[PDB]
Amino acid sequence: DIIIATKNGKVRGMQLTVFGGTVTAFLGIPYAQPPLGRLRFKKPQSLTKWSDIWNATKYANSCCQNIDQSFPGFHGSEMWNPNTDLSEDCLYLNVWIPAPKPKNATVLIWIYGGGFQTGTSSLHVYDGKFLARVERVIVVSMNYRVGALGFLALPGNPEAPGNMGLFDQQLALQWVQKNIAAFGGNPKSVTLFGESAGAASVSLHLLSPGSHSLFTRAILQSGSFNAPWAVTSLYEARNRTLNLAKLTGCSRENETEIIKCLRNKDPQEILLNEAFVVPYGTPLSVNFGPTVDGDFLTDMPDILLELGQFKKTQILVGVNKDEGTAFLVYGAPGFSKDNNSIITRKEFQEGLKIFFPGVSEFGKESILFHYTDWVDDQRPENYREALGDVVGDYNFICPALEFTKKFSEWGNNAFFYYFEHRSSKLPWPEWMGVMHGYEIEFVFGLPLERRDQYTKAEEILSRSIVKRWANFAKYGNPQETQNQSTSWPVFKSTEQKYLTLNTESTRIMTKLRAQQCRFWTSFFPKV
Ligand SMILES: *[C@@H]1O[C@H](CO[C@@H]2O[C@@H](C)[C@@H](O)[C@@H](O)[C@@H]2O)[C@@H](O[C@@H]2O[C@H](CO)[C@@H](O)[C@H](O)[C@H]2NC(C)=O)[C@H](O)[C@H]1NC(C)=O
Ligand SMILES: *[C@@H]1O[C@H](CO[C@@H]2O[C@@H](C)[C@@H](O)[C@@H](O)[C@@H]2O)[C@@H](O[C@@H]2O[C@H](CO)[C@@H](O)[C@H](O)[C@H]2NC(C)=O)[C@H](O)[C@H]1NC(C)=O
Ligand SMILES: C[N+](C)(C)CC(=O)N/N=C/c1cc(CNNC(=O)C[N+](C)(C)C)nc(-c2ccccc2)n1
Ligand SMILES: *[C@@H]1O[C@H](CO)[C@@H](O)[C@H](O)[C@H]1NC(C)=O
Ligand SMILES: *[C@@H]1O[C@H](CO)[C@@H](O)[C@H](O)[C@H]1NC(C)=O
Ligand SMILES: *[C@@H]1O[C@H](CO)[C@@H](O)[C@H](O)[C@H]1NC(C)=O
Ligand SMILES: *[C@@H]1O[C@H](CO)[C@@H](O)[C@H](O)[C@H]1NC(C)=O
Numbered sequence: 001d002i003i004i005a006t007k008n009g010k011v012r013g014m015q016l017t018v019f020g021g022t023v024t025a026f027l028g029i030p031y032a033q034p035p036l037g038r039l040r041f042k043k044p045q046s047l048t049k050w051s052d053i054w055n056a057t058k059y060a061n062s063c064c065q066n067i068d069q070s071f072p073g074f075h076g077s078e079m080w081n082p083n084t085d086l087s088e089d090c091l092y093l094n095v096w097i098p099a100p101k102p103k104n105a106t107v108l109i110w111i112y113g114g115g116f117q118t119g120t121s122s123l124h125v126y127d128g129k130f131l132a133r134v135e136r137v138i139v140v141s142m143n144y145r146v147g148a149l150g151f152l153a154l155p156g157n158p159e160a161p162g163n164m165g166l167f168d169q170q171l172a173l174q175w176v177q178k179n180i181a182a183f184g185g186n187p188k189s190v191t192l193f194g195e196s197a198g199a200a201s202v203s204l205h206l207l208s209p210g211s212h213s214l215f216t217r218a219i220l221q222s223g224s225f226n227a228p229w230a231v232t233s234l235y236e237a238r239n240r241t242l243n244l245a246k247l248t249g250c251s252r253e254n255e256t257e258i259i260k261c262l263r264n265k266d267p268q269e270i271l272l273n274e275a276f277v278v279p280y281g282t283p284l285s286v287n288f289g290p291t292v293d294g295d296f297l298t299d300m301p302d303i304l305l306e307l308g309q310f311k312k313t314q315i316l317v318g319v320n321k322d323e324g325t326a327f328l329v330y331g332a333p334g335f336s337k338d339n340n341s342i343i344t345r346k347e348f349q350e351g352l353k354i355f356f357p358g359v360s361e362f363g364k365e366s367i368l369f370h371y372t373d374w375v376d377d378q379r380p381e382n383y384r385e386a387l388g389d390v391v392g393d394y395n396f397i398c399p400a401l402e403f404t405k406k407f408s409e410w411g412n413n414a415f416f417y418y419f420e421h422r423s424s425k426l427p428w429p430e431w432m433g434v435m436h437g438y439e440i441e442f443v444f445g446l447p448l449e450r451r452d453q454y455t456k457a458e459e460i461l462s463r464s465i466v467k468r469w470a471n472f473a474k475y476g477n478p479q480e481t482q483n484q485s486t487s488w489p490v491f492k493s494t495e496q497k498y499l500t501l502n503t504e505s506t507r508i509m510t511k512l513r514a515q516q517c518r519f520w521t522s523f524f525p526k527v
């Protein structure tokens with residue numbers, strides 16, 4: 001029986017067997033007052049101490065959210081849907097510590113992605129027991145509010161100030177600062193890591209002054225705040241708050257009385273109307289996300305980044321080879337997960353219309369022009385691969401590379417990777433390649449489980465990645481020093497070296513997607 005006395009009361013965990021050893025799990029510790037009733041849309045309030053032994057032996061509720069229903073019964077999509085009850089009462093976190101209890105363990109804090117509208121820390125691919133067992137780190141993950149319930153913004157107005165989900169995350173980081181030494185953790189050695197909107201969230205903690213003192217280092221997997229989906233502007237934020245209000249019949253003149261009205265609405269009513277607050281959307285639409293609230297985010301983040309106003313520390317940044325393919329089968333014509341999705345020029349052009357609805361004809365013309373000067377001109381998958389590269393280069397790779405250049409220009413060590421291994425267990429078809437989100441199982445060490453049907457080479461790659469991530473968290477340097485591994489060079493704005501991660505040969509390369517990113521970063525923002 002392991003009971004740990006935290007600042008708000010005692011908690012009981014479970015013991016788990018992992019690779020012939022033991023990890024102690026505390027699943028489902030509250031870290032805030034439940035944001036219900038008059039607390040909905042408000043910042044998270046601090047928690048009132050309890051006098052019992054809180055039983056942290058089961059994952060807590062996931063936060064309210066719409067679910068992916070596009071492929072019922074298909075593991076490729078359903079592996080991401082919430083696996084605990086949805087509820088507004090969802091401000092909880094999880095702790096994995098090694099057995100025996102460590103003394104000053106580095107702490108890894110995971111922030112899941114999900115477009116700021118879905119996600120949950122209880123997912124199988126976010127299980128921290130492997131990292132705790134293998135690397136002797138402590139792994140913390142938390143649930144945070146998403147959708148309108150987490151990012152509705154009437155800026156200035158504390159009934160709905162915006163960014164609540166970011167403040168949930170921050171209040172969890174605070175909980176680690178106040179409580180992790182009781183679990184054997186070093187609060188002075190905390191590394192944030194996250195994927196997709198989770199990565200964008202990590203990057204916004206690097207800019208938020210209220211988070212500066214709550215972590216040491218940061219890891220950004222396939223995401224950053226300067227991506228085009230990651231920050232909502234104040235003008236469209238209030239357009240969307242207002243559009244949601246008319247949709248629920250909550251239109252008022254008292255902006256505060258609108259919130260009071262929306263607080264009497266059932267969570268389901270808010271959820272069904274979230275999709276329609278935008279006039280046109282895309283499979284990447286983020287109707288309710290981070291805004292410049294004047295609290296978490298004091299200025300436009302592009303400005304802060306450009307002017308060096310952020311936490312000086314090391315970062316580890318990376319992307320996957322086929323970030324964009326996942327989104328093509330959620331609306332692009334001619335695409336399907338159940339055939340090779342070979343599409344014509346006109347379908348490609350129709351595809352651009354779906355991914356760039358508000359963009360001018362000339363802007364779409366300019367995307368087609370840069371992505372369809374073919375070498376062979378006869379390969380039948382030319383247009384299928386081009387649309388995927390368009391969506392991936394614009395939405396993930398080029399912003400990640402630009403974040404890394406700008407951040408490292410202020411003197412900090414940065415490391416960039418390019419993940420190009422397709423999981424042997426990937427349920428999506430081969431033409432979708434190395435998909436968005438399918439490095440996560442390697443980071444969390446799932447192929448170390450010999451029973452889980454990964455190849456031997458995937459085990460080896462995962463063990464290397466897990467070691468590099470943990471050396472980054474512990475020592476700021478993502479080397480694997482014992483097995484004659486390729487040294488991971490620092491990424492500088494001059495040479496722009498990055499490391500490739502694959503089962504075959506890890507290689508040092510320079511200047512990822514050079515011609516593509518010049519287009520997205522220097523021409524396209526003008527259109
Ligand atoms: C800002 O909001 C207005 C409100 O229109 C909403 O449109 C739907 C999304 C629906 O969910 C309702 O809440 C609103 O009617 C947008 O104006 C509309 O624009 C589209 C065409 O682009 C079309 O529905 C109507 O012509 C417009 N409706 C009204 C009432 O004006 C507007 O486009 C939004 N965005 C911007 C940038 O202003
Ligand atoms: C690949 O499949 C798409 C999807 O259409 C359906 O997909 C399968 C599940 C199958 O069981 C059938 O129901 C359909 O084929 C195809 O896109 C369709 O293409 C034709 C016209 O080209 C037509 O039925 C629809 O307009 C398309 N549906 C869309 C765009 O959603 C596509 O043609 C298939 N490609 C190949 C190479 O087989
Ligand atoms: C990467 N990974 C695997 C962790 C993601 C994941 O687990 N779930 N992903 C969710 C998601 C959903 C949407 C939008 N859904 N809109 C809809 O109408 C769909 N519905 C029915 C309301 C759910 N957008 C984005 C997203 C946006 C920008 C960048 C990256 C992702 N992500
Ligand atoms: C907490 O766990 C103990 C151990 O099994 C159990 O006896 C106790 O009833 C639990 N408390 C609550 C409130 O469920
Ligand atoms: C843990 O390490 C920090 C510095 O990283 C040190 O200040 C602290 O006292 C240590 N705590 C232990 C060893 O319990
Ligand atoms: C109505 O709006 C005023 C500002 O015009 C605000 O001070 C007041 O609090 C609002 N009503 C309620 C019940 O809050
Ligand atoms: C290094 O190689 C040994 C085999 O010699 C293996 O057992 C170990 O897991 C490897 N370590 C890493 C970090 O890959």
Ligand SMILES: [Cl-]
Binds near residue numbers: 321
């Ligand atoms: Cl490539």
Ligand SMILES: [Cl-]
Binds near residue numbers: 345
């Ligand atoms: Cl052609």
Ligand SMILES: [Cl-]
Binds near residue numbers: 519
């Ligand atoms: Cl160009």
